[PDB]
Structures are given as C-alpha cells and as structure tokens.
C-alpha cells in the first residue's frame, strides 16, 4: 500500500502516473540523480503520454502531487535510502543497474519489506508475469516482472499451448525506439547496430524474451526463440509469433480461443480486436497483449502466424503494480 521508487526513467515515471489512478497503492518516496524541480518538469510534461493529469509543486525540496507530499532523495548508495523512515513496504527498483539479488537486497537492508525489479533478472531471482505464473508465487522477498516483450508473449503463448499444444515457435518483435538508441550514428560497443541512428534505420537486435518465457512457463522450455527489429516509432510494439501446433486448429478456432481468454480468465491482461488498428491506436493501452485477429495468417491447420500489440511502457508499468499488490496480499 506504500511504495518507494528508485530511478525516474521512462518506466519509473509511468509507474508513478498509473499509481495515482489506484486505491490500493500510495507512492511516498522517489530516488534519482536529479533535482526536485527537474523531476517535477519531467513528470508534468511528456511527449508520449501528454500533460500530467493533476497538480505538481515543489515545496522545500520535496514534491507535492495532488496534495500528497513525496520525499525526494538522491543518494546512489541504496543502503542509506532510509526506507524505514517514511516506512515503505515494497520498493519498485527501476535503475536497470541492480538486477541482482546481492544489489537489490540493499533495499530491505534499508528498511523496506519487498523488492520488485522492473526488468529481467540476471541471476536466478524468480520472474513473474500476470496470467502466466502469478499463481506460483511462493512468498519471496525479491521478484522480477520480466521484460516488456515477455509480458506480451507469455499470456498469448499460454492460451495457444493449453488449447492446441506448441511443438516449436519462432517470434519476431517489431520494437519501438528506446532510450538506449541514438539520434545520429554514435558509439555503442556492446551492440554495434544499436549505435546507429534510430530515426533512419530498421535495426536488427537480439532479445531474450522468447527463451525467458520458458522459465515462467516451463512447458515451453527450449521450444521458442526470437529476434527483434527496432523501427523509428516513439511507442507501441508488435509481436509476430510463428508456431507449429500438435492438435490441428483452424484460424477461427484460434480466434475463439484467444477471444474466450480475453473475456474470461485473462480479462485486463489479454486483449482482442477485429478492427483495422495501427500502432497509435494502442498508445496508453493497459492490457499487456492485444491479439490482432485480422492481421494473423495461417498456411495450414498446423502452421500459423499470430500477431499481437503491446505498449512497451504503459501496460508493463501497470502490471508491476499488479505484481506489487499481489505480493502484499
């Protein structure tokens, strides 16, 4: 019910905005390498999600949003974050630098009770994706909500595998531009393609989302692998999943299966549309996976190609809040 945010990046700020529209969660503390008046500016104005729908003021180095006061730190050593001072139960860790158990444990060292990582773990801290494996949470004090792309692929793949059985799958995501790319051709020694100008290029990139699903859904372990293309669009991405099915199924049977999940057990997580949509039509979508019925194709009853959209910022942020609420129940 009381959360602290570490890191005010794209993910951190959208997590903050989505928390305002909720009754179960109240953010009380924020940490980043930036001043308070600057954070008030970055929260007030956004090129992708418009102006902030509320009040923001700076009073004595602290933020006041909708009348509630937020404590603003800046220390880069998580041990001295004094989480117990304002007394936070869960910490949403969005630096992208402490995706390890050793580093993340500095937070509950500082007086929090649990830690949720807004990225895929690099050790073997457990991962959880809503609709995929929230059932199997076992009370751990540090968790991960996987990647933007894994939150879109896993719910769809569970529905397809449980109805028809997946023998093998290859996926490709047409991914929107992120903060790790460059405006003009620049240096990037880990990924040479990634340093090229994002505004002018289709940039192939590797991704771990397809094999990451094998851990949140052990049934498809080693049955999927994937690849990405980064394109000059500010937001919203799309997944293209090519799979072989054990049990034969027409395309209408697949539509009906997905449609039933989106209106049934996976309402709010999985979405369904039969309209002539484009990427902008999902700017601000909350579901982490919207099936596009009309864009998929089927060669035969056992070889099919499914496409599904996701807002790589909005839907992911909303689901880490659902993960925070789920681990405090």
Can you tell me which of 12, 131, 271, 296 binds Ag ion, judged by CB under 5 A?
271
Q: For residues 32 and 8, is the Cβ–Cβ distance under 8 A?
A: yes
Is 51 flagged in the annotation as binding? Answer: no
Tokens linked to 82: 């004094």
CA neighbor of 29 nearest in space, from 77, 65, 54, 55? 65
Determine if residue 150 is labeled as part of a ligand binding site. no
Q: Is 208 annotated among the ligand-binding residues?
A: yes
The annotation status of 13 as a binding-site residue, yes or no, is no
314 carries a ligand binding annotation: no
Q: Which stretch binds Ag ion (CB under 5 A): 64-72, 89-97, 162-170, 284-292?
A: 284-292
Q: Is 152 a catalytic residue?
A: no
18 lies in the site for Ag ion, by CB under 5 A: no
Span 251-270, contacts to Ag ion by CB under 5 A: 268
CB 110, CB 82: distance < 8 Å: yes
- With contacts defined by CB under 5 A, name the span among 7-15, 29-37, 130-138, 286-294 that binds Ag ion: 286-294
Nearer to Ag ion, 8 or 309 (CB): 309
When asked if residue 236 is in the footprint of Ag ion (CB under 5 A), the reply is no
76 known ligand binder: yes
Closer to Ag ion at the Cβ: 70 or 269?
269
**Other Cβ atoms closer than 10 A to 179:** 8
Q: Please, what is the minimum distance in Å from the beta carbon of residue 287 to Ag ion? A: 4
Q: Establish if 120 lies at the interface with Ag ion (CB under 5 A).
A: no
**Minimum distance of Ag ion from residue 21's CB (angstroms):** 13
Contacts of 184 (CB under 8 A, 6+ apart): 197
CA distance 91 to 110: 11
In the complex, minimum distance from the CB of residue 251 to Ag ion, in angstroms, rounded to a whole number: 21
The residue from 72, 116, 132, 148 that is catalytic is 148
To Ag ion, the closest distance from the beta carbon of 290 in angstroms equals: 6
287 is a site residue for Ag ion (CB under 5 A):
yes
Burial per residue of 203-237, b for 16 or more beta-carbon CB atoms within 10 angstroms, e otherwise: bebebebbbbbbbbbeebeebbebebebbeeebbb
For residue 293, state whether it binds Ag ion (rule: CB under 5 A).
no
The set of residues, in sequence order, having a beta carbon less than 8 Å from that of 139 and lying 6+ positions away, is none
Q: Nearer to Ag ion by C-beta: 214 or 268?
A: 268
**Where is 298: in which H helix or E strand?**
strand 297-300
> In 53-211, which ranges are E strands?
56-59, 62-65, 68-73, 90-93, 114-117, 142-144, 166-175, 203-205
Residue nearest to Ag ion (CB): 271
- Known catalytic residues are 148
List interacting residues with Ag ion (CB under 5 A). 268, 271, 286-287
């Amino acid at each position: 019910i009381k959360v602290g945010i570490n890191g005010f990046g794209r993910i951190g700020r959208i997590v903050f905005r989505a928390a305002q529209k909720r009754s179960d969660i109240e953010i009380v503390a924020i940490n980043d390498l930036l001043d308070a008046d600057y954070m008030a500016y970055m929260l007030k104005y956004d090129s992708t999600h418009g102006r902030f729908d509320g009040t923001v003021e700076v009073k004595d180095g602290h933020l006041i949003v909708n009348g509630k006061k937020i404590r603003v730190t800046a220390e880069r050593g998580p041990a001295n974050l004094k989480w117990d001072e304002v007394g936070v139960d869960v910490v949403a860790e969005a630096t992208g630098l402490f995706l390890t158990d050793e580093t993340a444990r500095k937070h509950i060292t500082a007086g929090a009770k649990k830690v949720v990582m807004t990225g895929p773990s690099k050790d073997n801290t457990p991962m959880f994706v809503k609709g995929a494996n929230f059932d199997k949470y076992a009370g751990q004090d540090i968790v991960s909500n996987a990647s933007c792309t894994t939150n879109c692929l896993a719910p769809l793949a569970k529905v397809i595998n449980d109805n028809f059985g997946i023998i093998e799958g290859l996926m490709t995501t047409v991914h929107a531009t992120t903060a790790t790319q460059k405006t003009v051709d620049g240096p990037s020694h880990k990924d040479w393609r990634g340093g090229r100008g994002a505004s002018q290029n289709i940039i192939p990139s590797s991704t771990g989302a397809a094999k990451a699903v094998g851990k949140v859904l052990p049934e498809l372990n080693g049955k999927l692998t994937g690849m990405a293309f980064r394109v000059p669009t500010p937001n919203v991405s799309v997944v293209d999943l090519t799979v072989r099915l054990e049990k034969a199924a027409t395309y209408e049977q697949i539509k009906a299966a997905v449609k039933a999940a989106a209106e049934g057990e996976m309402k709010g997580v999985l979405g369904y549309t039969e309209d002539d949509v484009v990427s902008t039509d999902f700017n601000g979508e909350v579901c982490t996976s919207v099936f596009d019925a009309k864009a998929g194709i089927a060669l035969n009853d056992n070889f099919v190609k499914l496409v599904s959209w996701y807002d790589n910022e909005t839907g992911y942020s909303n689901k880490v809040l659902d993960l925070i609420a789920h681990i405090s129940k």
